[PDB]
Amino acid sequence: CGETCFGGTCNTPGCSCTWPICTRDGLPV
């Protein structure tokens, strides 16, 4: 996802917040 979940929330669906980076299915894509 690459996106940073600074506010805990992610902009990309499927990506889980793994502060400071969102990971979809555990993948930091």
Tab-separated table of C-alpha atoms in Angstrom, residues 1-14:
chain	number	residue	atom	x	y	z
A	1	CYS	CA	0.000	0.000	0.000
A	2	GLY	CA	2.884	2.319	0.857
A	3	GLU	CA	0.462	4.807	2.392
A	4	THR	CA	1.130	5.926	5.945
A	5	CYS	CA	-1.729	5.413	8.397
A	6	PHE	CA	-0.670	8.376	10.523
A	7	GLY	CA	-4.210	8.691	11.827
A	8	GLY	CA	-4.580	4.926	12.137
A	9	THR	CA	-6.941	4.909	9.159
A	10	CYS	CA	-5.906	3.886	5.645
A	11	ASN	CA	-7.131	5.321	2.341
A	12	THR	CA	-6.802	2.010	0.511
A	13	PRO	CA	-9.391	-0.725	1.236
A	14	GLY	CA	-7.897	-4.003	2.377
